[PDB]
């Protein structure tokens, strides 16, 4: 475990904060909602035309959203290399630049890489807003007028709960706090030991690895609440009273929320799965150094 070899954990949100871009495919949670709406349209004959939208408008968007990330892939490799010299003290010695000047480039390169993923999909952002609005216009095709049946909407919730049951939320909840406790235990130790040791290169390499680790935990913690918000609300609707027939315009709002809430759960599960693997990996790096720190002070 010399250095980190995966940097798929970075993400960025727009200023309006409605859209979160992840490096993991589909890169957008709304595509998962679009994929999940296709399940809705299969049961209703009136929305059978939606398959053309999915075959063309949404499928091209996934390929187009993925391509915009590829332009940032080259800038990603530039940033990725900067971490390796910063995190490894023996590699940092060859560079022989100040720790702060090497840190300043990283911070500017961190936003620049963050900025590329955000800026390249800006034209794509208007598309996802255009697709789901088109689906709102398509939902006027249902042959109901204040008598829309809620069966299909409710048969999906009992199936979703089973899909909800597969993911173990409680194991993830234990993972973060214990790791975050070790994160705390590392940092508060460093603030008092930095005065004790005179060489900073080895402890600065940790201090960087710790600072980046703190960034990774927030992405895990943020997604966990949204997955927790997705399990709670969908489960609460199953607890709530179920009417067979609702308004046409209201059924549109019914369909959107479950797919909206479910898409975040699907999206969070992918990021949560990757984030812990990067979290335990950074924990593996912080510890191979801790052994290197103690041995040198002995002699």
């Amino acid at each position: 475990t010399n250095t980190t070899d995966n940097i798929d954990y970075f993400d960025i949100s727009d200023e309006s904060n409605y859209y979160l871009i992840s490096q993991l495919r589909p890169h957008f949670s709304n595509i998962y909602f679009f994929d999940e709406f296709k399940r809705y349209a299969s049961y209703h004959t009136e929305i059978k035309r939606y398959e053309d939208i999915h075959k063309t408008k949404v499928n091209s968007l996934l390929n187009e959203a993925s391509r915009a990330i590829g332009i940032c892939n080259r800038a990603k490799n530039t940033v990725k290399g900067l971490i390796n010299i910063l995190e490894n003290p023996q590699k940092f010695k060859t560079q022989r630049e100040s720790y702060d000047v090497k840190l300043r480039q990283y911070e500017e390169k961190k936003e620049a890489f963050r900025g590329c993923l955000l800026n390249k999909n800006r034209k794509n952002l208007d598309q996802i807003k255009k697709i789901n609005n088109e689906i709102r216009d398509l939902l006027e095709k249902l042959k109901c007028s204040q008598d829309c049946q809620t069966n299909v909407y409710f048969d999906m919730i009992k199936i979703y709960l089973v899909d909800f049951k597969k993911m173990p939320y409680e194991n993830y909840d234990t993972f973060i706090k214990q790791y975050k406790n070790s994160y705390l235990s590392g940092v508060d130790m460093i603030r008092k030991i930095e005065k004790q040791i005179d060489n900073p290169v080895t402890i600065n390499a940790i201090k960087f690895t710790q600072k980046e680790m703190g960034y990774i935990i927030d992405r895990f913690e943020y997604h966990l609440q949204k997955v927790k918000h997705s399990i709670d609300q969908v489960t609460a609707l199953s607890d709530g009273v179920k009417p067979k027939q609702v308004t046409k315009n209201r059924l549109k709002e019914y369909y959107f929320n479950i797919g909206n809430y479910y898409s975040i759960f699907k999206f969070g599960k992918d990021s949560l799965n990757m984030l812990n693997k990067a979290l335990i990996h950074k924990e593996k790096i912080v510890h191979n150094l801790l052994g290197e720190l103690f041995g040198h002070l002995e002699e």
Partner: antibody
Amino acid sequence: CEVKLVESEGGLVQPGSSMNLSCTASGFTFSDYYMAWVRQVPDKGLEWVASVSYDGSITYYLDSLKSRFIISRDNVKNILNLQMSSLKSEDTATYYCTRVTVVDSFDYWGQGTTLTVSS
Amino acid sequence: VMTQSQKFMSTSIGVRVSVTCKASQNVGTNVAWYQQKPGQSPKALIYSASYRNSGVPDRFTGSGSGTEFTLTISNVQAEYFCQQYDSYPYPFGGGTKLEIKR
């Protein structure tokens, strides 16, 4: 700036086909909206002719007209194309180029082209 | 597949006027209304019975669900077509020309 649809003649043709129609779209993104044509007769507009998907892969033809009509669309040049074979005195028509919403309603209409088929 | 229309109607400026369209197998909200001038292209003002496009004067309204539909307009200055876009074929009503009393 303004959404509009232009059309080609039109005019007298012989029963043995020999007629093609084109349509120009401007002021909007061609790819997002479907493209349909509509047929017209003195007493009309009941009958409707084909429409073409965004990609251009799937198209629906009138059962009566499926054998003698082919539709195509040029997304690149913003052109909607109609192909007719073995024209008949029933095919005599005015044709209005239309934009088709997702709800299959025709939100915008072209100026129209008048076709006459006889001997 | 379903289609109806009715005979022409005669009204004068300026009163409210209904146009009657029925048909045979419930299309729900799936109806469209187009206005055709005597020598100009058809223009769509009403889709889904109760919804009107932009660029459509406020006097034009629509109503009805299921099998029967009507179009009422409060004021007046030609021929109007009701359509089902729900299922193939997508047929318009024969249309009712408008005349002015005198």
